Amino acid sequence: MPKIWTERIFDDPEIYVLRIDDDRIRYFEAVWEIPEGISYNAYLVKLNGANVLIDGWKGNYAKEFIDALSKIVDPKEITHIIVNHTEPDNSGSLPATLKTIGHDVEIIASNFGKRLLEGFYGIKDVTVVKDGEEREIGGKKFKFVMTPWLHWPDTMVTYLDGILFSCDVGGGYLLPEILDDSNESVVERYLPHVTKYIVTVIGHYKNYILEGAEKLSSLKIKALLPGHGLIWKKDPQRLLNHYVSVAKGDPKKGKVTVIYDSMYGFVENVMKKAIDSLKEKGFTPVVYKFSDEERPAISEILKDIPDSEALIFGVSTYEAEIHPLMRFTLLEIIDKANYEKPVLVFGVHGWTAGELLKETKFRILSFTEIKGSNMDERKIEEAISLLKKELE
Amino acid sequence: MPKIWTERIFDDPEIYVLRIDDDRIRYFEAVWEIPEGISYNAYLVKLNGANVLIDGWKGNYAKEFIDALSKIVDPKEITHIIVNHTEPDNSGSLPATLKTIGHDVEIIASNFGKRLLEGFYGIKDVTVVKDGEEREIGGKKFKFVMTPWLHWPDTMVTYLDGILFSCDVGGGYLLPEILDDSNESVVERYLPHVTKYIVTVIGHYKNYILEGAEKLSSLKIKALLPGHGLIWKKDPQRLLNHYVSVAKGDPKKGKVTVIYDSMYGFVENVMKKAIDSLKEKGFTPVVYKFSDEERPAISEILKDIPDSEALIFGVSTYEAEIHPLMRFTLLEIIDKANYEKPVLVFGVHGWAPSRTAGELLKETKFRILSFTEIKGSNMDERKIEEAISLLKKELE
Ligand SMILES: [Cl-]
Ligand SMILES: [Cl-]
Ligand SMILES: [Cl-]
């Protein structure tokens, strides 16, 4: 019962999308909280003397995949399978597909893709395409562009007459209610889930997004067809621009993301005042609080980092270090969202956040001690004033 | 609105427990998953010429505490407050109590306790007691025994003619059906939630549990009255041996805890085989799996560590390092449940830039017996069999 889409999306070339909307999944990569779900998109190109399958579905949906595929083509007539990326969320249906096809097919992948298909599935008959290589298949020119580390070294994109099959590149979370970018309302709601996808999945490799976009700018792109989320037929440059904007960490003016843990309320009281001072100074804080009642999603925290003007952390000391969920959060921010942005740290003295961040691009403006009873609130207002002046 | 208990639990001396069952908290210390909730237990000792309050309730429950306390005594007749531990889950109600008392009392605490009461609450006039010090209050001898780092430096226990008011020491999660250790089924249910409490709260300082237990070995204890969970009037030594058992990590024969992350199911396939092999060699596996559908509570994983004979880890590789949730789990295990036990590691061979899983446990007290590679198709079943055989050889 997940929703399945199968639609013809171009007449010439004759191209179908096969999309399943995973509303079963709760954690992408087994960690990122995605209550909004994610889709898996595969494509079929039907030509004279060729039927080209591009990517696939997650392995637990392999049966639904063959059933949906069978409605648009007899799998026995498939001659080529292009694998832009071998991660099983896109490639999990491949062994079932190859068995269903029941005879040899040409399988096309990057150099690293072939090694992964071999390791994962025992697949041996893989044709390796190199960067810029062109193949004539069913009378049409397929061009293959290596875009490595987006987010694995096997990642490539397939170019067909202006149509880019890009798998992860251009992906996003969320199950949109149409296939494509033909509705503004849908596009605007979708984009933050693209942001969430970029950071959680590709964030460590964001510099490769800039190189990737640069490599692709040489090509005339009419449409972008990714392996997840919306297809872009009307304005592919808008999706690419967004990828770049997230990668660079272009800030929204006024946006400050505040993240803290609060066990007894001593941190909460300092934080509540910091947040008020932010508002009172014209800022729009987005607040993530770890407490004995509430637990934010790390995927949501990460999603909010790239377009923040600045970050604020409130940190309890805990034993020899700091609070475990703050350690975890800082470590993920450093790994996936390492941006050159200003930070305030507020902390309780124990019996540190600094050394974690000190090999990052983040620059701590000041540290402020969170005290209990003798807490001088003047030093809160002072830290916020310092931030505002930095941002002027 | 929480279940409150109010009950005389001793006639001589006259002692009341005030216990509230916190069914609102979801995470203790804002991290430990506790759907079973936790209680806060304060006590009142009524003496000739004295009324001694011992510890209190969490801050968000101050009003409920006051009204509760008021039914067993007029607060203005309170002469002494003993603060065994200053953490706000037990001390939060104190300022509202002082306010209601309305006149000066003797507030008793450890050296560190006094400094913290000032830091948290601005409370300044506190009587410091030292290790083994006795004060005569209301015709009775109160003895104070410092039990440091259980789990803070301020921690002490109060000894009153064989009755031990121990706050966190001897505490547990869970909101038991009754007050004391009078029902075996209840005791048996409750004890794993004590282990859960020990590891999550005190596990980092488990060596001080041993120091503390034997420090109290010279005291005739007929009752142990903690600040969380069950009271022990029938067999306090049973609870004490449990604390000691968890701290030493005494193993339940045959018990193995298997912890893995399965990003796509290749780890899962291998781990399922390992778990089958464990079973036919007579082990009873406890299994924790991070997948795209399910996510175990870290507090549950930690609780199962002390009496495990061995651990088995199944590890995905993720960029430079390891899986975030497995990193977190490993770091909390090292921090809270660092035991000298044998470990099997199963890991995917990644293309990470050349810290490793086995590098993390390398400094710790766990002993890695072997590493086995998780391969996709072409995985040799034989390799899993010999890892489990090697484990059974170690454990007998
Ligand atoms: Cl706090
Ligand atoms: Cl962590
Ligand atoms: Cl896996």
UniProtKB/TrEMBL annotation, chain B:
Transmembrane segments: none annotated. GO terms for molecular function: electron transfer activity; FMN binding; metal ion binding; oxidoreductase activity. InterPro entries: Flavodoxin/NO_synth, Flavoprotein-like_sf, Metallo-B-lactamas, ODP_dom, RibonucZ/Hydroxyglut_hydro, Rubredoxin-O_OxRdtase. Residues 256-396 form the Flavodoxin-like domain. SUPFAM superfamilies: Flavoproteins (SSF52218), Metallo-hydrolase/oxidoreductase (SSF56281). In the N-terminal section; belongs to the zinc metallo-hydrolase group 3 family. This is Flavodoxin-like domain-containing protein.
